[PDB]
DNA sequence: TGAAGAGAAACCAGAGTATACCAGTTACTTCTGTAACTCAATTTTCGGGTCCTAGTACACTGATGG
């Protein structure tokens, strides 16, 4: 919606790299799960046309912009006068934008959504008129989904790499498969490898 | 009065002789690099698409059998 801020559209985005849990659980895969990535690293940017607007909202946001302005205050690197904001004091309505330019979206670190602006219209009365759900998603693209490298059966929980049971590296569990081949009875790993907890991204997203 | 050689008119291979190639080398040039601006021609390379054939997921259908 025009005219309603930035962090409003950044909030809304869904995209797996918020609800990835970090940590290997290899010893033990009971563990309480660490706060998705969504808690941890909460910070993002938008950069629209040389102007990065921060999400500088909350206290564990950290400028992610200033290691691009440095990397170009260096040695020129094409790009130029780059500017700041913050995102909350912006709303789609005061931006200076092209339509059909892929702008950036950063998240998560290095999680990095190409931003479109397909076109822009006068609301109608035939579309939802409501505000608390208008950042509204039109549509999402049905991804594909991971399943259990053991039996197809389930969806993947876990990916374990160096894995002494493993046929492929980075191999896919459901969680009784992988409890049942890396575990002999009380939670010792029988062999060695890497386990991770792996959230589906044709399943959140 | 034959004998042991004397003379005579044929072939026959071979040793110089005659070619017959077959290399063996002296000058005498171009062609490098660097520099530069010019402009067009041509190549390279380079990130990304592009089309195509072949599976793949996934919700649903359609029996099927106990
Ligand atoms: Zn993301
Ligand atoms: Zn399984």
């Not at 409501?130 to 991971?146: E, F, N, Q, S, V």
């Not at 009784?176 to 589906?200: I, T």
Request: glycine share 6%; aromatic share 16%.
């Amino acid at each position: 919606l025009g005219s309603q801020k930035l962090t409003q559209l950044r909030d809304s985005i869904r995209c797996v790299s918020d609800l990835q849990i970090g940590g290997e659980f290899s010893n033990t895969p009971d563990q309480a799960p660490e706060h998705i990535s969504k808690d941890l690293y909460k910070s993002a940017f938008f950069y629209f046309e040389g102007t990065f607007y921060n999400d500088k909202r909350y206290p564990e946001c950290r400028d992610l912009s200033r290691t691009i302005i440095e990397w170009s205050e260096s040695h020129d690197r094409g790009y130029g006068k780059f500017q700041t904001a913050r995102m909350e004091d912006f709303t789609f309505n005061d931006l200076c934008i092209k339509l059909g330019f892929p702008y950036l979206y950063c998240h998560q670190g290095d999680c990095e959504h190409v931003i479109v602006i397909t076109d822009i219209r006068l609301v109608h009365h035939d579309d939802c008129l409501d505000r608390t759900l208008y950042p509204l998603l039109i549509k999402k693209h049905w991804l594909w989904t991971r399943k259990c490298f053991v039996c197809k059966m389930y969806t993947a929980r876990w990916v374990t790499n160096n894995d002494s049971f493993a046929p492929e590296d980075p191999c896919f569990f459901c969680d009784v498969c992988f409890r049942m081949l890396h575990y002999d009875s009380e939670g010792n790993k029988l062999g060695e490898f890497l386990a991770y907890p792996y959230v589906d991204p044709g399943t959140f997203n």
